[model samples]
Target chain A: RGLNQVFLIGTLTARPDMRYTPGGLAILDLNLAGQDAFTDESGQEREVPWYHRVRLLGRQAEMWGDLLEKGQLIFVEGRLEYRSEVQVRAEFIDPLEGRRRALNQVILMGNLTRDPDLRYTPQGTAVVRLGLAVNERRTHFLEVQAWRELAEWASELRKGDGLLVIGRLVNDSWTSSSGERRFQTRVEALRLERPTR
Target chain B: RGLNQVFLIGTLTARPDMRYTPGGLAILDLNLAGQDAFTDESGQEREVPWYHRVRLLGRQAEMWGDLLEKGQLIFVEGRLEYRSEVQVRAEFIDPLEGRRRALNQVILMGNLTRDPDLRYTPQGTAVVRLGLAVNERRTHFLEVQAWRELAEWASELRKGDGLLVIGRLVNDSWTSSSGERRFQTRVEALRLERPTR
Candidate 1:
């Protein structure tokens, strides 16, 4: 298949935290939430029919980390991909279970969901939740996970910050003792920055 | 429901033609076509899959009447709606065929596809075709038929034109001869123009 262009606007539910891989790849994750009024299969008005965790990477990661905060508003764009996972079995004599996967997320840009918050994780990664509020009827919640350079910069930002992030969505899978596989929406941060509010 | 934004990059298959109701609402008709690649249920590459048809009252009609032409490549954005018509059969026996109208089209910013030999319809409307490159593998050919002001203005243009159109997709429905119902696509066009780029 070819490239698909996806555009989304939402707000940040939680603050962002940073992490590093053995290979030293910068990763940023966030909970971007939005609500849409939809008529369900039974014809009932549903406030939220979709929930997604948007992740960013590359240049977008480094740029947006310091500019966004919890309760902030922002817009994002990227392609859609589903991630699957497989889990191994726990019993020594049990047959191995097949792999399972889930849909992952990637964000090309994030305008502040609201503002940035300063916080710290057990690992001492400086972090903040970027808030992004759009003019919509349904309400949702989410968080942005920042790492490395972004984690440190976001610590200095205040509320109502606006910025953009560049990244891709990825799937992280792990096998449980029972051989059950779990998948998560992963973000590979690429570029980050604070643009004009 | 409120209007939703839609954008399409396609070619014009025919000329601009004009039609007016007794109430004096001018409608410009044109065909817009698009091709996409997809895999069949069996998981084989289906080459190209597409649908083509004309739109009434679109971005092209609202703007850039002078610069649109047949065989011209273009991009469109609009809302979706249903347009329909009712017909009277024998005496009290009345039946409508063109019911359940749902339309998808774009307002014009500029032309993306280009070809000379473009002209207006007998009513002196502008007409053009995007090209075989897009639909060479698809079945139905697409075109944007313009009428009245749009036809008059779009009739004069060279190939390779670029334009922007902001509009919406709409639909309509009616009763058929067999008492069955049918529908059609409606495109409520706005701000049609030659794009700066």
Candidate 2:
């Protein structure tokens, strides 16, 4: 596996655009922008605005197309894919084993600030949603969700449980009641666990 | 700040133990185990075994550790912390942000791979030792070194290069010719770039 990964935190430049493939699969295209402040070669603190284009497929694309809005802050984890001429697309790669090599992974640990809620899909699959409080130099809150076995495990967890999660960054999109299009970035947990000391 | 992080593939059974702060930073202890196999709840034709215990400092511990141990493959990434438990310490924490954060970062791109070289050590600051072959799906090569200033911009990068890099994941602990010990993990480049396409 050749490594071409990117981790970014940015604001959505606009609402996402969703279309369909001839096979009828859903596709969403997103435009995101961010600024990086660092010491430059000449000893000056420089800030550069960076722009990236991300494409999402299937369920994530459809879901995000309806749930996201412009100007929201987001965190993205994806692979830098070469897309001809002058285009480089940062797309989300599936995290299933054997599909990737090296390290293209993200970890987020925190306290479950919100009570864990478990739900089921019409297909009868399990899902869990919760909020996490990450206390860094500044305290940041993250909303995370888990599925399948991880969902079952998290379903039993409580509001105050300490949480550790590992996953990929994905864009969730959707259309609002106002018909405003939107997209949000979130972690798709591959492994979710409670640290029992 | 926005969190950008990585997870690694490694074993935890080899590290020593954890030590605490006497002035007393609230310490919670934990131990974990892991197993892996692929089996649907039904006795289908799937086999994957898995198990692991990761500690959480405050609430989690006041809460998995005793319930989990050797031989299971685990996926992990987090800030490294030095620990000394009440003493039977197997210190593996859930991969999360903030509880124990920063300093565990690794960024690598495709088309580069070569065994790294190790050299130099005098009066504190030594030259750099490393070789990077960006060998992913494509095979590109890169040799990066650093001194004081991003090691002279990686000492003049050669061959068709817009390679982008950020650092950390230095492993500078080794036994010396005199049997003494040395410690350090250095980032050879603040930025390693390639020709703009």
Candidate 3:
């Protein structure tokens, strides 16, 4: 499967424009101008501005239509629907006051609840599975999966091995044999680290 | 504006299965069991197992075919391609030794390079734009945008306001005035917060 996701922070390139789709759904479109300064191949730092197109639908279309304008600074999370267009699915910004929320992140450190199981696919790919036991105010058990190089790397893990994972959340859904539909939320890891002593 | 992304850690439910599409492209499919313990609405902590479907394509299919197995612990980065399937694009796992990298994340704290400019579109939506100056070993300037509630929140910010942004990277592409296609990478903010003193 192809992956198309984006996270962006920048100034509004223009005011948000709201319109109706042929199906009568409200849609909003806007442009964002993002800037970044980075070292080039030659090691010289350079800054450049880029323009992105953002699309909004459902409640986001109605809510942001009157709440955004040119020159606004914002953050957006969405999917790249096409070449330059991003279909925003969630929006966030700095609050005026109170505690800050890091909405799209997860961090956990724990131990393996059980030994990892290693196996191969029909095509000869390697995968491994194990469990994580994390303790907060209470104990939490989490399932962990590894593939490819990482799977090979983790093949030596035993039950009770310490692990630290950095990742995000995802929902998995399926239908049961009895015809019941079910879904659950879990973290999809981006980095698995060993805790420092 | 909207978000649908996932991060997962779990054990492989079964061996990875490989198949070829009509075009002879290699594909791999597998299942994971992710467990999490959390307090329910009843305030009682409970652990539950969640099943997730994962898909790997192209080089990952070929590389992982021999590298994964059942009961392996792993971490994965990707998006939920459907109700039950996750298409992994980037992945990580705990190494036997050394530090792990936190991939697919961006964090920045800086000052606004300029006062925000607020305006409305023809549709009357509020938008604002401003610039941020982030300092590391060198000074870095970034563009910031806010919409709707965020627009109002950031409207009171000044050119020197300290701001912290947590988000990920996105590629913004467009055709230049000369009709040449161009693209740039930028951080899409997930959370904007005040820098702590």
Candidate 4:
């Protein structure tokens, strides 16, 4: 069986939404904007924004509805339940209190698949798209997106550069030309560093 | 986006399998038979068998290949990557040492949706399947499979009984007559207890 589980540390995108099902069940729905990380070829970590929905039921919805605050960091443990939209069904949801950066973190040491494609946003914010192959075997391919000042020097990165990326896992989605909805996961670099020997 | 993360603590079903990719890359493949727990309605904990596959690559594969033992408990962090099969691509894997039941545990308190259906295995092991609806609001439905002594008394449990389930989530798979592969997740009761109130 395909195992589906997720752990996220993110900030609330907005106030928690609460509603009652036709069957009188409580439903709490909210959006979490988590950040994924990856290191640019130049050894800088970058963060990419990943957004998803968290679903809580029954008393959890009622109890947590007023407890959650916008822009608050929180922790979640659940699995992606598919029902047309992939959303997290929380087995546990807690605030990120007294813990330091314990959520949405990804660490990887690998080489670049190709030269970095650095670009600038309309606001002149630097951004770059990097293809990373980790596990040392160059078998696992991942996309690492970097933004802001972190994207500056990464523009100089060449293909096959060994870099260590401390990032977060970000979720992304798009509509295909066929009008089909597609989803993907990638790294958003937060901090980049050179691999230590 | 549908989150595809997974974390599991289970014993190896068999020795870690190692092979070389045709591209000269090292690949480590192994099966883990993790125990998932759920509390029977009778306030006893039970366990069910949940099995999944884990994939490791490169040095992690090389380093861990010979280091793993049969029935050794380990901790893994990763996400299910899908192709034809859903398998965990380890973001991290380590032996579960110096930790006490720190992984693969689920704590849920809820009510029963139906009476438990008890059965016996060919080997004389007692088994029972209980439908659990948690969230006090009875919004989420889960199947809790209890075993052995836990199954014996759970058979006497009735619907709408408020129960506390300290269990583990398990992954299961099957094929239908249409040749379509289907997968599901359920809880295996570890310890059953009554609500504190």
Candidate 5:
């Protein structure tokens, strides 16, 4: 019963499908679609399509089953559920690319476990990856991934340095040889700080 | 990247193993072990075993490799990484069951989409499930699952009710038929509030 959460912004691939579970609990099965847009060496934009399965249960399932239409843009907040497949169980959904932004911010303070590493994406975007050790009750080691100017800033940073990071948790997804779906999470930094005593 | 994050607390199954990626990025592979302790209908304690693979990289991986021992209790904050398998990419690793606590909190305010339903586990624990509509730009539906006294409070509640929820993000993992690993995220509520506004 530790922590489990997932957040994704996508559109409905089709209408939500209605079904029932063993206890007559209403269920809705949906396919959510998304894409990652980036520029490549050719300076042309490229897209990596993302397809996800989402399950809604109970009255939420039944209610959305009726009103939701195909291709509706949505932001989903839910837990990852792995049954026969890797899928999402949405807890909160924000619609229509809201003017009101949803929240997924992580502010962490820690010491660098090692010097940061800088790499350039295929599109020439610089990304920095570093390991951070945050000691709460215990030592929690975390990875912080940053880009652009922030990435540039960490170029001289070395191990054991103190910094505060503001970032959002993001999912890392890959397609494995077994064709089994899997997901991992990381903190994608938007800002960095030199902490003052 | 919309939102993808995972938080977990577990003990190391074995010592962190050292490996190197194609680019010579240092990698530490470790097994995380956890168990959910529950009471069964027979009123006896039961345990569900959890096994997780955590991959650490860079200087963090190299540094931790030298110090981490087996069976060390830890809290993990990172992104879910899905490669050939389902594993954790440690962004932050908390050490030694720290006095300083880890973080995984979610606060959301929304309206009920429908009425709530109350159910009981085999051990007689009451759990309530409800649907919510959170509108930013458009209407997005979500599921709210609650337990015990909250379940008791919602017995008389109906649809379209206004509420505020404070919960912690968590991961829900399962094994699929294909033996592929999967994970989901959810908000595990700790507090609920009635809005006066």
Candidate 6:
């Protein structure tokens, strides 16, 4: 419950875009790219693999969506919320519900690390997907969801961009036809923008 | 930039009753205490000397003022906000100035590590103090100050108590008549108290 709870600074994996829920509210999806560095005993440097996930929310989604590119660096901050559930009825779940949510991810209220990928949502919303390349060694990726002002703003960005974002941490759990459960540590963003260079 | 910040759980050093602006509202002030730990290479444990100088703000100030104490151990969360300013003029501050106007420190909003101290402020506001032994071997002591509820609750604290607080991080500084500058880095609490067992 301290201010040092969760914070991340990395790159985007795709040109994020905004989508609408059945309720019609906006949720931008994002994937941030990141990696770690350490000095081995032999003083040799090696690269690692990479992975990308999604982030949601209004300002963050739209702003980053339009501001970043395929190879930018960025920073983000938010708390890490954990959610666990039972999967007796889920098919894709690594482990079903009744188990605790031991989520290992962060929500976002941030800015861009690179350039933007401008596009429109199905509903004709002005948006884009900001792409960020977190790492080449241990290539990790992250995507941020945006909408409204965020969408409009991100649409105007270019390479070597920087941003900051804030959001709530969340996850989804759905049972597949095969009774497997699917889950992800996602976010509902709050703020998003590029700090003055 | 990174999440390498630290949190503290301790008591306030004084009372928190005050006025805001043009008599707009009543504000509370607090001074929460905190510590840092450093482990030795051989796994030996040694505590460091205690340092003072932290502060808290508005809403948080009011909350903890109603329930904290000098000796109580509380939890606190806040970043170190450092600033350097000069006193342009004395009246320039009266309505638009801050207490040290030229001072800097950290704040908190967390919990108490112990209980309340049964003491009272000079104005019957309530007061308490704790001999903070940060490094057991080095034997350093931080004199924590508290007010109001914190003072009341702290009056009931014992060894190994736990509480939460939210406050600021700051340094106590002063320029001698000859203009010598000195500073202390420690947290000042806002909201705090005992929780769980």
> How do all models score by TM-score?
0.29, 0.39, 0.33, 0.34, 0.32, 0.34
Tens digits of per-residue lDDT for model 6, B18-99: 4464655434444444443433444577644344433444555544445544554333334333333211111000010000
lDDT of model 1 at position A92? 11
* Tens digits of per-residue lDDT for model 6, A50-119: 3334354555554444544444433343333222421111101110011010122232323355677767
Give a tens-digit lDDT track for model 5, residues A61-109.
8666676657776655665445545466777554542111234445566
* Off by more than 4 A, model 2: A1-105, A175-181, B1-6, B9-11, B14-105, B108-197
Query: How would you encode candidate 3's per-residue C-alpha lDDT over A159-195 as one tens digit per residue?
Result: 8778765544433357989999965434445556664
As a whole number from 0 to 100, the lDDT of residue A172 in candidate 2 is 53
User: What lDDT would each prediction earn against the true structure?
Assistant: 0.40, 0.46, 0.57, 0.65, 0.63, 0.40
DockQ category of candidate 4 = incorrect
lDDT of 3: 0.57
For model 3, the stretches where C-alpha displacement exceeds 4 angstroms are A1-103, A120-125, A178-180, B1-96, B99-113, B116-164, B167-197
Residue-level lDDT for B140 in candidate 6: 28
Question: What's the i-RMS for candidate 3 in angstroms?
Answer: 6.7
Give the poorly placed runs of model 5, Cα more than 4 Å off.
A1-9, A18-29, A35-59, A65-67, A78-89, A94-126, A129-144, A152-188, A192-197, B1-197
- Model 1's CAPRI class is incorrect
Residue-level lDDT of model 4, residues A27-139, one tens digit each, is 88878886545555567898766788889889778877777777876666665454455467786666533112235544455678999998876767799988776663215
Give the lDDT ranking, best first: 4, 5, 3, 2, 1, 6
4 against 6, candidate with superior DockQ: 4
Which has the greatest TM-score?
A: 2
The per-residue C-alpha lDDT of model 1 at residue A91 equals 10
- Tens digit of per-residue lDDT, candidate 2, span A62-161: 7666655567544446543323311223344211111001222345666788788899877767778778776641555667777777888788778877
> Total clashes, candidate 3?
71
**Measured by TM-score, how close is model 4 to the native structure?**
0.34
The alpha-carbon deviation from the true structure for residue A11 of candidate 6, after best TM-score superposition, in angstroms, is 3.6
**Comparing to the true complex, what docking class would candidate 2 get?**
incorrect
